[PDB]
Design an enzyme around this catalytic site. Structure first.
Site, short mmCIF file in Angstrom:
data_model
loop_
_atom_site.label_atom_id
_atom_site.label_comp_id
_atom_site.label_asym_id
_atom_site.label_seq_id
_atom_site.Cartn_x
_atom_site.Cartn_y
_atom_site.Cartn_z
N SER F 211 0.75 -1.43 -0.15
CA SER F 211 0.08 -0.02 -0.11
C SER F 211 0.88 1.25 0.10
CB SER F 211 -0.90 0.01 1.28
OG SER F 211 -0.28 0.78 2.30
N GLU F 277 -30.58 7.64 -8.54
CA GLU F 277 -30.38 7.71 -7.09
C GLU F 277 -28.95 8.66 -6.99
OE1 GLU F 277 -31.51 4.14 -4.89
OE2 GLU F 277 -32.19 6.24 -4.71
C1 HEM Z 1 -15.98 -2.72 -4.11
C2 HEM Z 1 -14.97 -1.60 -4.42
C3 HEM Z 1 -13.81 -1.81 -3.88
C4 HEM Z 1 -13.07 -2.32 -2.95
C5 HEM Z 1 -13.77 -3.76 -2.21
C6 HEM Z 1 -11.63 -2.13 -2.65
C7 HEM Z 1 -10.84 -2.59 -1.71
C8 HEM Z 1 -9.48 -2.16 -1.65
C9 HEM Z 1 -8.61 -2.39 -0.59
C10 HEM Z 1 -9.02 -3.45 0.61
C11 HEM Z 1 -7.57 -1.72 -0.64
C12 HEM Z 1 -6.28 -1.75 0.40
C13 HEM Z 1 -6.49 -1.33 1.50
C14 HEM Z 1 -7.08 0.17 1.61
O1 HEM Z 1 -6.15 1.11 0.93
O2 HEM Z 1 -8.19 0.51 1.82
C15 HEM Z 1 -7.47 -0.93 -1.67
C16 HEM Z 1 -6.74 -0.01 -2.35
C17 HEM Z 1 -6.93 0.59 -3.35
N1 HEM Z 1 -7.86 0.98 -4.27
FE1 HEM Z 1 -9.86 -0.33 -3.88
N2 HEM Z 1 -11.55 -1.31 -3.51
C18 HEM Z 1 -12.44 -0.58 -4.35
C19 HEM Z 1 -12.91 0.18 -5.23
C20 HEM Z 1 -11.90 1.00 -5.67
C21 HEM Z 1 -12.18 1.96 -6.78
C22 HEM Z 1 -13.45 2.35 -7.33
C23 HEM Z 1 -10.77 2.73 -6.95
C24 HEM Z 1 -10.23 3.61 -8.18
C25 HEM Z 1 -11.30 4.10 -8.94
C26 HEM Z 1 -9.88 1.98 -6.12
C27 HEM Z 1 -8.64 2.06 -6.26
C28 HEM Z 1 -7.54 1.69 -5.23
C29 HEM Z 1 -6.21 2.24 -4.98
C30 HEM Z 1 -5.46 2.96 -5.75
C31 HEM Z 1 -5.61 1.64 -4.02
C32 HEM Z 1 -4.27 1.54 -3.42
C33 HEM Z 1 -4.45 2.65 -2.21
C34 HEM Z 1 -3.15 3.12 -1.53
O3 HEM Z 1 -2.40 2.05 -1.72
O4 HEM Z 1 -2.77 4.21 -1.18
N3 HEM Z 1 -10.45 0.94 -5.48
N4 HEM Z 1 -8.91 -1.11 -2.51
C1 HEM Z 2 -26.00 -11.36 -5.31
C2 HEM Z 2 -26.48 -10.33 -4.61
C3 HEM Z 2 -27.65 -9.53 -4.57
C4 HEM Z 2 -28.89 -9.93 -4.75
C5 HEM Z 2 -29.39 -11.36 -4.84
C6 HEM Z 2 -29.72 -8.78 -4.88
C7 HEM Z 2 -31.06 -9.02 -5.14
C8 HEM Z 2 -31.97 -7.84 -5.05
C9 HEM Z 2 -33.21 -8.04 -4.76
C10 HEM Z 2 -34.28 -9.23 -4.95
C11 HEM Z 2 -33.79 -6.79 -4.73
C12 HEM Z 2 -35.31 -6.39 -4.93
C13 HEM Z 2 -35.69 -6.17 -3.48
C14 HEM Z 2 -35.60 -4.66 -3.04
O1 HEM Z 2 -36.02 -3.83 -3.66
O2 HEM Z 2 -35.35 -4.43 -2.04
C15 HEM Z 2 -32.77 -5.73 -4.92
C16 HEM Z 2 -32.71 -4.45 -4.96
C17 HEM Z 2 -31.55 -3.60 -5.11
N1 HEM Z 2 -30.35 -3.97 -5.06
FE1 HEM Z 2 -29.77 -5.89 -5.02
N2 HEM Z 2 -28.88 -7.95 -4.80
C18 HEM Z 2 -27.61 -7.92 -4.59
C19 HEM Z 2 -26.48 -7.48 -4.58
C20 HEM Z 2 -26.62 -5.91 -4.62
C21 HEM Z 2 -25.35 -5.04 -4.74
C22 HEM Z 2 -24.23 -5.63 -4.68
C23 HEM Z 2 -26.09 -3.86 -4.97
C24 HEM Z 2 -25.17 -2.42 -5.05
C25 HEM Z 2 -24.12 -2.19 -5.92
C26 HEM Z 2 -27.35 -4.12 -5.05
C27 HEM Z 2 -28.30 -2.80 -5.05
C28 HEM Z 2 -29.65 -2.99 -5.05
C29 HEM Z 2 -30.63 -1.79 -5.07
C30 HEM Z 2 -29.92 -0.27 -5.11
C31 HEM Z 2 -31.72 -2.20 -5.06
C32 HEM Z 2 -33.00 -1.43 -5.06
C33 HEM Z 2 -33.43 -0.87 -3.50
C34 HEM Z 2 -34.76 -0.51 -3.61
O3 HEM Z 2 -34.89 0.71 -4.06
O4 HEM Z 2 -35.60 -0.96 -2.96
N3 HEM Z 2 -27.87 -5.13 -4.55
N4 HEM Z 2 -31.49 -6.67 -5.03
#
Ligand code: HEM
Ligand code: HEM
Ligand SMILES: COC1=C(OC)C(=O)C(C/C=C(\C)CC/C=C(/C)CC/C=C(\C)CC/C=C(\C)CC/C=C(\C)CC/C=C(\C)CCC=C(C)C)=C(C)C1=O
Ligand code: HEM
Ligand code: HEM
Ligand code: HEM
Ligand SMILES: COC1=C(OC)C(=O)C(C/C=C(\C)CC/C=C(/C)CC/C=C(\C)CC/C=C(\C)CCC=C(C)C)=C(C)C1=O
Ligand SMILES: COC1=C(OC)C(=O)C(C/C=C(\C)CC/C=C(/C)CC/C=C(\C)CC/C=C(\C)CCC=C(C)C)=C(C)C1=O
Ligand SMILES: COC1=C(OC)C(=O)C(C/C=C(\C)CC/C=C(\C)CC/C=C(\C)CC/C=C(/C)CCC=C(C)C)=C(C)C1=O
Ligand code: FES
Lengths: 69, 109, 57, 28, 116, 387, 34, 153, 387, 51, 28
Positions: F211, F277
């Site tokens: 990191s 949203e």
């Molecule tokens: C589900 C979304 C994401 C997950 C689970 C995730 C997870 C992580 C983790 C666990 C780390 C290392 C620990 C930390 O620095 O907090 C990390 C580092 C980093 N992430 Fe992600 N991340 C996500 C989204 C993103 C996005 C959208 C970007 C850029 C567009 C990004 C860019 C980076 C960078 C540049 C690092 C290195 C930071 C450093 O070393 O200072 N990540 N991410």
């Molecule tokens: C495999 C995992 C997931 C399943 C099976 C799932 C399934 C569903 C289902 C059945 C609904 C409709 C029920 C409701 O409206 O509350 C829903 C709504 C929604 N899910 Fe997921 N989902 C998953 C993961 C995610 C993730 C990762 C996101 C975000 C990136 C997300 C964002 C949403 C949103 C924004 C809605 C609409 C909420 C609302 O306005 O009621 N879901 N999802």
């Protein structure tokens, strides 16, 4: 590749130190530091948001009063 | 040289199989036969007051109706066709002098 | 706190049972207290406080 | 002779946990 | 030259702000150059004497300890800091000059970045 | 050593991979709490998957039953309101945490070498998050869902020759109907699992070099194991996030939403105010800033082009904004501009918001055009600032 | 001159001072706070 | 059994109400901005239009309705209902009571939701104090350490 | 060597893990075509995921629409019959290659040390495959979907204290209804992604020691790379499986199933011949033979306990059946018994099938009882048979 | 019969074409495997051991 | 070798587009 370091480090056990009182130690100096270093950064973040918002309310108010008979 | 020929022969099939399985997946998302079945119909209409509009219904699309007044037509007949992004005269759009019928969906999104 | 340490913290198995007991009893104590604050802050607004309850013709 | 004591102490932890996750006071 | 502080007063404030920031942690400006950022840097660092690199590695450890502790160098130590005393730029320019000479003659590069 | 006998179980082959990547992985000792948002986003992803799986046991993806199945979750199933509110507000917590995460990497130049691939995988994850959250918001089948799905599928019509055939292929028909809803449900189940794989690769790229740190310097001389030092630091954030999440869940479960999605979808009448949203509003504002169909869609793609090209600009060798006064100032202006764009997308399209939206969009793109200039000019700083 | 690290290795010091900006120690010889 | 429907379908509703649909009231306080205050102000907010504003026959003026012309007539005339407990059923009293009913109908889980929120935010606050102490206890050996190095500048 | 320059791209960090684990992994040169069903099982898993995802874009999980939505796929969806037949028969193909995969391991003692974790991970994979296949068979909501679910969700009632409580929590009510079908659909979407993860663990655990070979000996002296030798060996099997699969898809698409699932589910009437899919028949015949409900469920569990306990029995040091003639014949009797159990399962409960099932279940369990003693006797073979 | 299986004709025409094509791919695959393995299968291995 | 290979792959890509998408009728 490992670094090659030469240093002496003394450490005290966690169970020999006060854990929480350091959070409110020299509190005024902490605030002084935070405002001193960051007032330029806070101005570059707050001024555009507040300035643009204030103009939009100023615009909408005048435009609402010109259309009023 | 001979082995290249034999291998190319089976590569014709390998690419053909890859094409078929991908295109079957993609086409299964295209409009279904029952969806394409409900794609043609016509309805009749009534009348309304001068200066108001009543949305009507079709496949999933609304249709606008606007019988226009005299000063309304004067307004709609004083627009430079050149300045319009879509140059068209009001008389071309209308089959009646005042009755304006149009599909009521924005051409943006 | 060392007398307490000698009975409960010496073995992890006891200290784990101590955390499970405190999770149980602590959760119940907060449940009762939050409910008592809700009753005291909502006098007269409950379903048992409807005056004509049971008297619908 | 401690393994029997660790077993007895972890069974008590298991029994307290079971009574804690499922709370069958209405069924006892 | 706009970037020269002796002429541009805005460059003077830029140098002063950067110098004050480095001084607080005991760092030199060359300490902000990381071997991982660029292969030309780590080739230059390997060419520097052991004593130069040891002092740089110690200044980096001292700064990280300060950064971890949310504290600065004591003011009697900040007064003896030399934020812009250079040790790396001259070597880095030479290393880059030798790389350009290899490229101009179609030679293979002496070192390459791994593809991550 | 010769490993004749068995030492610590963590170093056995049963757990060695887990031990070296999660327990003993060296971490810079001066990481601040801004480095705790990667684990927060990982927890939000797990919270979304777990609640969504259980919500999918009660939801019916049919235009005649979708709205009522969500109401049946809130009214009939025990704890159904909690599953629904934890999922609907969890997507919001997922985007707050990831947005703070992104701006951390922008402030400390965490995208620079050697971590270009880490940023690029993150940009892809952001795209996967946007699509996943958008198609999920269609599932309740309310007024916002219907009209939201109508325009974003219509986005493909910006392509001249094959735009209309893509829009209709996306719909599965000549309009947004049950075919759109049923396929959106299937994709909404699959995409989160692709998000899990993408985040695992994202993490593996990060562990190639370790990191970055708030000083932006080489940090191998002062590193500590992740466990317990940054586990307990992350645990502070996890509890803080839980308090923040719980406030939204129990006391304000509908402020981060629009009441229009509590009206069943009506294909005949658009609502007078139609917006996505809140986490999509800055993209919305940039889209409407262009008075051209193709121009607006091209600008949206150019937003992700500029993010992807950012780690590859020829820059100066200093990472952290704490030693880059001009870049530090530009970062806070970008942050204010991004907040302004989100507010503009929340406004009707009329004066003065069109002019303000156009200037805000321009300033956002000015951040990415000026940054390569900064590093190119600042390359000469050491030769000009002498001792 | 002799480097500071060398002096420390050569001269054990029973009067060690710790960094007290974040944590203040208990008096030496106090019972552990475990 | 669900509460019974007044009409057989939406087209029957529109035919009985001048072409306007009386919306379903199960979620109306959640389906409008500031919904509880909106419903109260709308029901009690029937009055004469401002000067120079005429209302099409079959419509009634209500400034709280967007556009100011609502197909709903004034329905909360005084003593329009008779209460079982003995509360004077004025327009404002019935307007208050019907919104309390409608608000509960939109969110019947509110009481359980609020008792849960207070309980857990209090508990999670306690864990945050312990989380902070735990983090500080582990890190204290690092934060109070004395580091000796050779370098000066 | 000093890696100053870039050599082959496969050795660069972007692709080193794929190079080492997939392309360059050392493999015994004498592996037979029986060693190619592991990849076939992975391909069958991928086909099921891909076809299932696109089938879920048209299926409705409601008791009022499920049967008709499957009929709408077969009729209205362009290419729908093929997606449905590739998935319905792909499930049968999945179990054929996995059963051959399992019996390959039993013949060559592939479960033996040092690969006990490989066999244990496989048994867990087998349990997940059964659950995934069973709940998927309920999705069409035909007559066998409804009555097949009514039995298996009742297997919990054999538990005395909480058996009825588990059945009703499993059902979501007091009978098999929409709550059961809606929850089975959600679990049917999630389990295959867990099945992918378990197969990845399975493959990783095997690569810690490498594959066993037909001779059952140490094979380090004659190992070769997986690519391209066992890539082209596996490709021959992939093409042959595609021919085998195509014959079922295009010419016998319904002979592997039962016509009763083409009747919509009737909770009132009951089919006189209620059977599972053919790949559950051997388990189903073991359950039927015990004339006690609790004993039958105990026996089904004992099947998986016996399988999990096979690798840990003290045994002789020879692996392959090519040098263990008694274990060889012992293996060929088990395969005939397993084929007999499947056939008996399809037969109704009446004489003589009740006794044949009881003896056949006895013979199945005798294999795992007689296997350990044979190792204890066989450890003295080298002493007895001297030069 | 047609009402239950309206896709029989399209399904049958696909089966004949693709099984014919897949059989040809099996021949090429057999040749490819044997060609690649021939350097291994024909090799002469000389060791010192006898028994 | 650089322009020839570029034109060769550009031809391969164009033939592949005509092969996957078969718009025989779009030649208008
Ligand atoms: C589900 C979304 C994401 C997950 C689970 C995730 C997870 C992580 C983790 C666990 C780390 C290392 C620990 C930390 O620095 O907090 C990390 C580092 C980093 N992430 Fe992600 N991340 C996500 C989204 C993103 C996005 C959208 C970007 C850029 C567009 C990004 C860019 C980076 C960078 C540049 C690092 C290195 C930071 C450093 O070393 O200072 N990540 N991410
Ligand atoms: C495999 C995992 C997931 C399943 C099976 C799932 C399934 C569903 C289902 C059945 C609904 C409709 C029920 C409701 O409206 O509350 C829903 C709504 C929604 N899910 Fe997921 N989902 C998953 C993961 C995610 C993730 C990762 C996101 C975000 C990136 C997300 C964002 C949403 C949103 C924004 C809605 C609409 C909420 C609302 O306005 O009621 N879901 N999802
Ligand atoms: C005539 O009659 C018969 C049939 O009819 C025709 C048959 O067809 C068969 C053949 C059937 C089989 C071999 C299948 C039976 C075996 C199994 C294992 C059943 C498959 C299992 C199930 C159906 C149960 C499904 C499981 C669940 C619903 C578990 C739910 C729990 C979940 C998802 C998670 C639990 C939650 C928590 C721990 C809370 C926290 C969770 C987090 C994720 C955070 C037989 C024998 C038969 O005689
Ligand atoms: C106390 C009794 C009633 C209450 C609380 C009530 C409530 C409401 C509410 C909340 C709306 C929504 C307005 C909006 O969309 O902003 C509405 C609209 C409407 N109501 Fe009622 N209603 C009542 C009685 C009636 C009656 C008795 C009728 C017919 C005789 C009626 C006919 C309508 C119509 C036609 C509309 C739609 C008007 C329009 O959109 O222009 N309502 N009502
Ligand atoms: C989806 C299910 C499965 C997949 C994808 C899978 C995949 C594989 C693969 C790719 C291999 C290495 C190549 C090979 O030997 O074929 C392998 C080996 C093996 N598998 Fe499986 N397998 C599955 C199910 C099972 C099951 C159910 C069992 C046992 C109950 C099992 C036991 C084994 C064993 C013992 C080996 C090592 C064989 C040897 O070394 O000779 N597998 N598996
Ligand atoms: C995530 C991937 C999967 C999804 C989304 C999925 C989804 C579906 C859907 C929607 C159906 C109903 C359509 C139909 O009747 O054919 C179905 C049926 C079925 N699935 Fe899956 N499935 C998946 C993976 C699997 C796997 C791995 C297996 C094998 C263990 C399997 C076995 C079945 C079976 C046996 C049926 C019933 C076929 C029938 O009688 O029509 N599925 N699946
Ligand atoms: C009023 O207007 C508007 C809305 O409304 C209220 C909105 O909400 C949004 C919000 C949308 C944003 C920010 C962009 C969403 C971006 C994408 C890429 C979504 C597009 C993807 C879709 C629809 C599904 C993907 C489908 C695929 C891949 C097909 C699957 C096929 C195979 C696997 C073969 C915007 C901008 C808007 O202006
Ligand atoms: C020498 O050792 C080896 C073997 O033994 C002798 C093999 O038999 C094989 C060939 C067989 C393999 C790889 C089996 C497939 C692997 C697994 C874990 C089984 C199930 C896998 C699935 C369903 C793949 C899904 C995962 C995906 C899509 C991950 C995301 C990645 C991409 C999209 C690219 C290989 C490569 C091997 O080296
Ligand atoms: C020094 O090292 C470490 C870090 O610094 C870079 C970290 O930031 C973290 C904390 C953050 C992590 C691990 C984020 C990872 C999150 C991801 C990939 C998304 C959510 C995670 C899931 C779904 C788990 C996926 C993993 C597996 C094995 C699948 C099986 C798991 C389950 C079914 C629960 C940890 C533990 C760490 O050690
Ligand atoms: S759709 Fe009406 S302007 Fe975008």
């Amino acid at each position: 590749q490992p670094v090659k370091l030469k240093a002496v480090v003394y450490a005290l056990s966690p169970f020999q130190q006060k854990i929480m009182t350091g959070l409110w130690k020299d509190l005024p100096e902490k605030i002084h530091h935070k405002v001193s270093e960051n007032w330029i950064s806070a101005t570059l973040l707050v001024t555009p948001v507040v300035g643009t918002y204030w103009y939009a309310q100023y615009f909408k108010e005048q435009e609402k009063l010109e259309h009023r008979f | 040289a001979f082995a290249y020929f034999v291998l190319s022969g089976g590569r014709f099939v390998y690419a053909s199989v890859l094409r078929l399985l991908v295109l079957k997946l993609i086409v299964s998302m295209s409009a279904s036969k029952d969806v394409l079945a409900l794609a043609s119909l016509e309805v009749d209409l009534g009348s309304i007051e001068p200066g108001t509009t009543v949305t009507v219904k079709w496949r999933g699309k609304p249709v606008f109706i606007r019988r226009r007044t005299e000063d309304d037509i004067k307004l709609a007949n004083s627009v430079d066709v050149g300045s319009l992004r879509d140059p068209q005269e009001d008389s071309v759009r209308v089959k009646n002098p005042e009755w304006l019928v149009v599909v009521g969906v924005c051409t943006h999104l | 706190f060392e007398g307490f340490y000698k009975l409960i913290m010496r073995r992890n198995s006891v200290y784990v049972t101590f955390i499970i007991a405190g999770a149980f009893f602590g959760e119940r104590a907060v449940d009762y207290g939050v409910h008592k604050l809700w009753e005291r802050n909502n006098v007269g607004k409950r379903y048992e406080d409807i005056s004509v309850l049971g008297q619908r013709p | 002779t401690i393994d029997i004591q660790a077993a007895a102490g972890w069974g008590i932890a298991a029994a307290a946990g079971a009574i804690w996750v499922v709370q069958p006071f209405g069924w006892i | 030259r706009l970037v020269d502080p002796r002429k541009n007063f805005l460059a003077r404030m830029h140098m002063k702000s950067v110098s004050n920031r480095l001084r607080r942690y005991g760092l030199r400006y060359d300490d902000l150059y990381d071997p991982l950022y660029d292969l030309d840097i780590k080739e230059a660092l390997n060419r520097l004497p052991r004593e130069i690199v040891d002092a740089r590695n110690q200044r980096l450890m001292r700064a990280m300890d300060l950064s971890m502790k949310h504290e600065y160098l004591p003011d009697n130590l900040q007064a003896v800091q030399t934020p812009f005393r250079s040790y790396l730029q001259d070597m880095l320019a030479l290393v880059k000059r030798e790389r350009a000479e290899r490229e101009a003659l179609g030679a293979l590069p002496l070192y390459q970045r791994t593809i991550p | 050593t010769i490993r004749n006998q068995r030492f610590s179980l963590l170093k056995q082959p049963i757990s060695s991979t887990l031990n070296q990547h999660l327990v003993d992985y060296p971490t810079p000792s001066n990481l601040s709490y801004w480095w705790g948002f990667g684990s927060l986003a990982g927890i939000c992803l797990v919270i979304q998957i777990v609640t969504g799986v259980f919500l999918a046991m009660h939801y019916t993806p049919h235009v005649d039953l979708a709205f009522n199945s969500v109401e049946h979750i809130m009214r009939d199933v025990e704890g159904g309101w909690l599953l629904r509110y934890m999922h609907a507000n969890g997507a919001s917590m997922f985007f707050i945490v990831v947005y703070l995460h992104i701006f951390r990497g922008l402030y400390y130049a965490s995208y620079s070498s050697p971590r270009e691939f880490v940023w690029c995988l993150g940009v892809v994850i952001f795209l996967l998050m946007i699509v996943t959250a958008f198609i999920g918001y269609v599932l309740p089948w309310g007024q916002m869902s219907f009209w939201g799905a109508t325009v974003i599928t219509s986005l493909a019509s910006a392509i001249p020759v094959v735009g209309d055939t893509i829009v209709t292929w996306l719909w599965g028909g000549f309009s947004v109907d049950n075919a759109t809803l049923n396929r959106f449900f299937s994709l909404h189940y699959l995409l989160p699992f692709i998000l899990v794989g993408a985040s695992l690769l994202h993490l593996a790229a990060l562990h190639q070099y370790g990191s970055n740190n708030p000083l932006g310097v080489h940090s191998e001389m002062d590193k500590i194991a992740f466990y317990p030092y940054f586990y307990v630091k992350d645990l502070v954030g996890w509890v803080a996030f839980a308090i923040f999440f719980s406030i939204w869940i129990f006391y304000a479960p509908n402020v981060l939403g629009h009441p229009d999605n509590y009206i069943p979808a009506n294909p005949m009448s658009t609502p007078p105010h139609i917006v996505p949203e809140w986490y999509f509003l800055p993209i919305y504002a940039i889209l409407r800033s262009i008075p051209d169909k193709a121009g607006g869609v091209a600008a949206i793609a150019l937003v992700f082009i500029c993010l992807l090209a950012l780690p590859f600009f020829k820059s100066m060798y200093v990472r952290s904004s704490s030693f880059r006064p001009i870049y530090q100032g530009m970062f806070w202006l970008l942050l204010a501009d991004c907040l302004l764009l989100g507010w503009i997308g929340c406004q009707p399209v009329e004066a003065p918001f069109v002019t303000i939206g156009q200037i805000s969009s321009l300033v956002f793109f000015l951040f990415f055009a000026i940054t390569p200039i900064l590093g190119r000019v600042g390359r000469g700083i050491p030769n000009s600032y002498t001792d | 001159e002799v480097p500071a690290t060398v002096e420390a290795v050569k001269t054990p010091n029973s009067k060690i001072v710790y960094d007290d900006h974040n944590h203040e120690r208990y008096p030496p010889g106090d019972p552990s706070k475990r | 059994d669900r509460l019974p429907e007044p009409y057989s379908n939406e087209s029957a509703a529109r035919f009985a109400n001048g072409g306007a649909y009386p919306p379903d009231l199960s979620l109306v306080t959640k389906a409008r901005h500031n919904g509880q205050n909106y419903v109260f102000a709308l029901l009690t907010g029937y009055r004469d239009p401002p000067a120079g504003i005429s209302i099409r026959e079959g419509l009634h003026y209500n400034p709280y309705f967007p556009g100011g012309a609502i197909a709903m007539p004034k329905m909360l005339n005084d003593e329009a209902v008779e209460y079982e407990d003995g509360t004077p059923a004025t327009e404002a009293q019935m307007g208050k009571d019907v919104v309390s009913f409608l608000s509960w109908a939109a969110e019947p889980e509110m009481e359980e939701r609020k008792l849960m929120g207070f309980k857990w935010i209090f508990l999670l606050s306690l864990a945050l104090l312990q989380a902070a102490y735990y983090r500080r206890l582990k890190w204290s050996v690092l934060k109070s350490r004395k580091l000796v190095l050779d370098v000066v500048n």
